[PDB]
Design a protein around this ligand. Structure first.
Ligand SMILES: C[C@@H]1O[C@@H](Oc2ccc([N+](=O)[O-])cc2)[C@@H](O)[C@H](O)[C@@H]1O
Length: 437
């Protein structure tokens, strides 16, 4: 195999208690909040279809003019405690927060740039307030951090000269300064989730991504670091040139979850999917009619899908410029929350069950060999087919919400019909299996 100084560090899955916690959490929320919430995808009376947090790009807005949006940053309805309560009611165990998105505006009063919350009418340390409020509810906080920074002239998209190399070096020192600052100001952070690391400039500096991961693990014991940060000696990203995952989990699947039949390889490493409610809006966008908006069951389906394949799922929110959430997002949080309250035993601290996928829905495995059937598609046959692996027998089936016994009929070796419940639950539901050796 290829000689590497900056390839994969972990052999298989980390199993220290912090990584176990990161994994067992399973369901998180994402917060994309930045200057982009003010225009909300509209620039000079025109609504753009592109992702709102990218509006500076779509509308060709110079750095100086975009960043003047700071003068309007005054989220008067913001209440960190109420944000924390919303997250708790939704059943999220963690929240990932945009500390600085591509635009380069910091949600914490960084010492290293003037483009921060400190220099707006609101003045207050938003990041600090959220970290405390979430933590007070027993919710872990993860930091989103964009390496790419449209506010800083030293950023480069590629290195094709000594000049680029010198500027980028300065940029990387500035970046390191911000990272160490976050890590030491907010020592309860559990994860750094890097974004804007896809450029050729970053690929040519694999050494730096490995140093950034080491630097943070040294500052925050047990911290998690995503694969999206990492490039190796050859510029190959996420997985090194020997095929081994870099960082602590694979971060991806924003557009496409792993196929439950063809993508079983993913069960071999920790991973996390983040998802938007509309097709592709992360930051606040004023017009959600421009693309398909996922219903609660469609989101729940994805959450279970991820867990059923040994992955976490994170649901994105784009708070309004006033510091409140749109009613579509409040409804989603509440609907997920109701369902999680009923059926979350099949999600929290669950993993890949090792069973062949069936059409009615998903399996998840509890930590102590509970096998949960999560039914999204109710069979007219009134029979849920279960094909067990070699050695496995189904001893009992129980409806999760009521404890009622569910009929199990053996149909052939390694195959059973689990009866649907006597009364249709009328929403996606869970049947718990007692299995044996
Ligand atoms: C979470 C998102 O991350 C990136 O956009 C991406 C990056 C990767 C994928 N992806 O590989 O599916 C999709 C959107 C960002 O540019 C962005 O605006 C948002 O923060």
């Amino acid at each position: 195999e290829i000689p590497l100084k900056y390839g994969a560090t972990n052999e298989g899955k980390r199993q220290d208690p912090a990584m176990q916690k990161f994994r067992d959490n399973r369901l998180g929320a994402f917060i994309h909040w930045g200057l982009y919430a003010i225009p909300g995808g509209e620039w000079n009376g025109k609504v753009y279809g592109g992702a709102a947090e990218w509006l500076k790009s779509w509308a060709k807005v110079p750095a100086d003019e975009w960043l003047k949006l700071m003068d309007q940053w005054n989220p008067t309805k913001f209440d960190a405690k109420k944000w924390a309560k919303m997250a708790k009611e939704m059943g999220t165990k963690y929240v990932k927060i945009t500390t600085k998105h591509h635009e380069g505006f910091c949600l914490w009063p960084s010492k290293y740039t003037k483009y921060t919350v400190a220099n707006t009418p609101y003045k207050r340390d938003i990041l600090g307030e959220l970290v405390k409020a979430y933590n007070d509810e027993g919710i872990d906080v993860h930091f989103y951090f964009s390496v790419m920074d449209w506010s800083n002239p030293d950023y480069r998209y590629d290195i094709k000269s000594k000049e680029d190399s010198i500027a980028f070096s300065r940029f990387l020192e500035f970046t390191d300064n911000q990272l160490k600052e976050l890590a030491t100001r907010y020592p309860t952070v559990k994860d750094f989730w890097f974004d804007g690391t896809w450029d050729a400039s970053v690929k040519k500096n694999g050494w730096w991504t490995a140093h950034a991961e080491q630097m943070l693990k040294e500052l925050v014991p047990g911290v998690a670091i995503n694969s999206r940060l990492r490039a190796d000696d050859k510029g190959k990203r996420h997985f090194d040139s020997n095929g081994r995952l870099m960082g602590d989990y694979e971060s991806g699947y924003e557009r496409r979850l792993p196929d439950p039949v063809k993508d079983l390889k993913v069960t071999q490493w920790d991973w996390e999917a983040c998802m938007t409610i509309p097709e592709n809006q992360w930051g606040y966008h004023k017009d959600w009619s421009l693309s398909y908006v996922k219903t609660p069951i469609e989101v729940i389906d994805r959450i279970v899908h991820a867990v059923s394949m040994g992955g976490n799922m994170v649901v994105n929110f784009g708070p309004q410029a006033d510091g409140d959430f749109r009613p579509e997002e409040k409804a989603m949080a509440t609907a997920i929350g109701k369902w999680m309250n009923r059926y979350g035993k099949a999600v929290y601290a669950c993993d890949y069950a090792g069973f062949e996928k069936q059409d009615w829905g998903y399996y998840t495995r509890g930590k102590n060999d509970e096998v949960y059937m999560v039914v999204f598609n109710q069979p007219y046959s009134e029979r849920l087919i279960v094909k067990t692996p070699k050695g496995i027998t189904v001893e009992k089936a129980t409806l999760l919400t009521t404890g009622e016994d569910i009929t199990v009929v053996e149909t052939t070796r390694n195959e059973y019909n689990v009866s649907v419940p006597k009364k249709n639950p009328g929403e996606p539901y869970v049947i718990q299996l007692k299995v044996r050796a």
